[PDB]
Each structure stands twice: as structure tokens, then as C-alpha cells.
């Protein structure tokens, strides 16, 4: 049985920090004031690029890839590049690797952030194993690793827009939204950052839309409306009351909703427009002038 301890011995306390020291080392107790070993292990001094490795899936090794200008690989390059290309057929080598390489291609193209862009791809490798009603489509659970990957910051989304991009935004996206929950609800001020950035509006408009939407809810003006709708609605009130305006087709297009729908919530909150804005709000166009819709 592995027991590891630094107990002073002379006056067992069971137990207290003994110091790491600065130069002398050995962790002498501030109690018996004795010694313990010699230390001699600098953890600060890790292997830099100048050997260290940060593996996230299994264990990384590598093979071949010869390029040192000493003797030309020519004949031997193809001897070994073919020989290592034969070996990646023995025990289901493909799958995780194919998934992580195709993963870095789909994210890089939309310019998804690496720190959290890579985080969601770890989630996929946890989701590709385990067998819980996946009805797996490859693309489907990829839109989960496209959402949590964009969760770093609203880098590309505005997740709805990246959903509206490409293929499969509907029932197959539903199976995936459930897999991720197996969360916190999603609110007005959740998509405001992204929606506004894609819409290209200023911090002014963002903040007011964000204050309108919260009061729309606080005032229960939009009973059973989807938060996305409320948000896209509020973003229309805000922006329309500023200079930098955007149309319902422009807002709907980024929010991922339909003008009809945005009109529905908008018209529900318009009658309280006054009580909804920031207070210190500017106004290129005033409330008595906002589109009634």
C-alpha cells in the first residue's frame, strides 16, 4: 500500500505544510525544525520547445516523417511512408483520428477559436463513445461541437447563423441539442453579443436591445415567446431608435428567425417602448416615431 508522508517524526502534528524553502530546500518543519530528504526536483523547469506532449485523445507517438538533410530520403522516404501507411490499417486506427482531423478543418474554415474550439471536439470523442440514443449522423453531433466550440466567446455565432449555414438545421439538430443537455435555459441577453456583431451595430445599440429584452421579460410583455424571438425583436426596437438601423429581414437573417415572428414579438413590446429603453438612451428616431409594425 502506497503511503507517502513528510511528517517531521519528532513532533507529529498530522499534519502541516513544511515550507518548500527558496534555496536550501528539504522542507524543515517550523515545529521540530528538522529535515526531510533533499528535494532536488524543479517543477518550474519543464521541457520547452527547445520531450513534453499534451495529448487529449489516448497517447501520441508519431512515426517516420524523415527530412534531415544528411542523406536524401528519396527511395527510403517512400519505403517508410508506405510502410507506416500500411500499419494504420491493423486495429481500427481510423475513427478518432479521422474525426479530429475533419474537426480541425470545419472549425478553421469558419475561424472557430482554438482554446474552446478544441474543447468541444473533446466532447465529441466522449459523445462518439457510450451508446445513448445517438441516431448518430456524424454531421449532427458535429453541430454540438460547433456550438460548444463557439462557446469560447461568440466567435462565429450567433450559433443559429452557423446552424443556418450548410446542411441539416431541423429535426437532426434537435437530436443533438438533447444529447448536449444529457443545461441553463438560454436567455435574451445570451445571443445579443453575437447577433449584434454580425448585424454590425455599436455597443450602444447592443446595450439598449439588451436592456429592452430583459425588461420585456421582466414586464412579461411576451408570454410564451422563444427568447431568440424576443431578442431579435428588442434588437429591432433598439436599432430602429438609433442611427445604425437594420431591417427585420436583416435581423431575422442573423438571429435565425423570420420577420413575421420578429414582428410578432416587436408589436408586443412596442406599446411599452418608453419603459423599455435604457433611460440615457440616445435616439436618432424617438419612440413616438418608432415603426408601430
Amino acid at each position: 500500500n502506497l503511503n507517502i508522508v513528510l511528517t517531521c517524526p519528532e513532533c507529529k502534528v498530522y499534519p502541516p505544510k513544511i515550507v518548500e524553502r527558496f534555496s536550501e530546500g528539504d522542507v524543515v518543519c517550523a515545529l521540530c525544525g528538522l529535515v526531510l530528504s533533499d528535494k532536488l526536483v524543479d517543477t518550474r523547469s519543464e521541457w520547452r520547445t527547445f520531450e513534453a506532449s499534451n495529448p487529449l485523445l489516448d497517447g501520441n507517438n508519431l512515426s517516420t516523417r524523415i527530412g534531415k538533410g544528411e542523406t536524401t530520403d528519396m527511395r527510403f522516404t517512400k519505403e517508410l511512408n508506405k510502410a507506416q501507411g500500411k500499419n494504420v490499417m491493423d486495429k481500427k486506427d481510423n475513427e478518432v483520428q479521422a474525426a479530429f482531423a475533419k474537426i480541425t478543418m470545419l472549425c478553421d474554415a469558419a475561424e472557430l477559436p482554438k482554446i474552446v474550439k478544441d474543447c468541444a471536439k473533446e466532447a465529441y470523442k466522449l459523445c462518439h463513445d457510450e451508446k445513448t440514443l445517438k441516431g448518430k449522423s456524424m454531421e449532427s453531433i458535429m453541430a454540438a461541437s460547433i456550438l460548444i466550440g463557439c462557446r469560447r466567446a461568440e466567435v462565429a455565432r450567433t450559433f443559429k447563423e452557423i446552424q443556418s449555414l450548410i446542411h441539416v438545421k431541423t429535426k437532426e439538430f434537435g437530436k443533438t441539442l438533447n444529447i448536449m443537455k444529457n443545461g441553463f435555459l438560454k436567455i435574451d441577453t445570451d445571443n445579443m453579443s453575437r447577433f449584434c456583431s454580425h448585424l454590425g451595430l455599436p455597443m450602444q445599440v447592443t446595450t439598449s436591445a439588451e436592456y429592452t429584452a430583459k425588461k420585456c421579460k421582466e414586464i412579461k410583455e411576451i408570454a410564451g415567446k422563444s427568447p431568440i424571438t424576443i431578442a431579435v425583436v428588442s434588437i429591432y426596437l433598439n436599432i430602429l431608435l438609433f442611427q445604425i438601423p437594420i431591417t427585420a429581414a436583416k435581423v431575422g437573417q442573423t438571429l435565425q428567425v423570420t420577420e413575421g415572428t420578429i414582428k410578432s414579438g416587436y408589436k408586443i413590446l412596442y406599446e411599452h417602448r418608453d419603459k423599455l429603453v435604457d433611460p440615457q438612451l440616445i435616439a436618432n428616431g424617438v419612440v413616438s416615431l418608432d415603426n408601430l409594425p
Binding site: 434537435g174 435555459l185 422563444s226 427568447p227
Partner: protein, 180 residues
């Protein structure tokens, strides 16, 4: 609670015990539609009790739309009687209710997201997909669809009593999240 959920739909199965020529049934029965290219069964409806039956070549059928256990058995008997009257050795066998759906109205609004966050292990709420909250009750095993309006849908029951017990169990939590 003071309220009693209303049974809205009952699904039952019946084995008529004898093979059927769906093409013939569709030809001699009124209000029947048969399109094998999309569904290998004859869809037939009657007015009393207002129901719809799915009749198969195997002689087995599903009766839907009934609002009471009696109407379900009664309707099932009429369909079997028609199959016979057409010319088959059909018999009324293995009658069994497979699902009962009921609805309510607690009369007050409900803050759904608060209810979902509170009972996360039983409820799934994402207005984006569906406006109502899906509550999967354990005992009895009944699925509820809770709406902001106070409207309640209860399904998955085999005995009408389960709908009633499901509603009584959920009423306290519905009340707790009442918007007031």
C-alpha cells in the same frame, strides 16, 4: 386540486383473428382509404363513436380517437362487425387499451423555465423546439406537456386512473411556479 383531467383520446388494439384482403375491405367499406404505397393498412372511420381504425392484412387493428373506455370497446366492435358484414371470419378478440391522453386547465399561467430548472431530471424545456415543457413523471409513468397558459397534456397512461394520479402529483409544482 379541485380539477379533473378530461380524457381526450384512447388507443386500443383488437385481433380479429383471420387474414384480410385489404383491397377488398377498401372496396366494400364506406369511408375507407387504402394506399399501400404509403401504409400497408386500410384506414376507416365511423361516426358513432367518432373514431378511426387502422385495419391490417393480418386481421389486427388499432382503434383511435375514442374518449372513453366504453366508446373504445364499442367502436372496436363496430369495425369488426363491418369486416364480418363484408365477408370475413372476423371476431372481436384481445381488446386492449394501449394509451390514454387527457388534458387540463389549471386556469393560471406558469413560469416554465423556473419549473424546468427546479426539476431538471424530469423536465426538458427548450421553447426553440417546442413551446411546452416535457415532464417525464416516474410514478405513475406519465408524460406531461406543460404550457405557459396553464394548459396541461397528460399521456402514456393505460388506466384512466394514472392520468388522474399524474395530475394530482404535478398540481403542487404547477402551483408553485404560478405566475402571480
Amino acid at each position: 386540486s379541485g380539477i379533473v383531467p378530461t380524457l381526450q383520446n384512447i388507443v386500443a388494439t383488437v385481433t380479429l383473428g383471420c387474414r384480410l384482403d385489404l383491397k377488398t375491405v377498401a372496396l366494400h367499406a364506406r369511408n375507407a382509404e387504402y394506399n399501400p404505397k404509403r401504409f400497408a393498412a386500410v384506414i376507416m372511420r365511423i361516426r358513432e363513436p367518432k373514431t378511426t381504425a387502422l385495419i391490417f392484412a393480418s386481421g389486427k387493428m388499432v382503434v383511435t380517437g375514442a374518449k372513453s373506455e366504453d366508446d373504445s370497446k364499442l367502436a372496436s366492435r363496430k369495425y369488426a362487425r363491418i369486416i364480418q358484414k363484408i365477408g370475413f371470419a372476423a371476431k372481436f378478440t384481445d381488446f386492449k387499451i394501449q394509451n390514454i391522453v387527457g388534458s387540463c386547465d389549471v386556469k393560471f399561467p406558469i413560469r416554465l423555465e423556473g419549473l424546468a430548472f427546479s426539476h431538471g431530471t424530469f423536465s426538458s424545456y427548450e421553447p426553440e423546439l417546442f413551446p411546452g415543457l416535457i415532464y417525464r413523471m416516474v410514478k405513475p409513468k406519465i408524460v406531461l406537456l406543460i404550457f405557459v397558459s396553464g394548459k396541461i397534456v397528460l399521456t402514456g397512461a393505460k388506466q384512466r386512473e394514472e392520468i388522474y394520479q399524474a395530475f394530482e402529483a404535478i398540481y403542487p409544482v404547477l402551483s408553485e411556479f404560478r405566475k402571480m
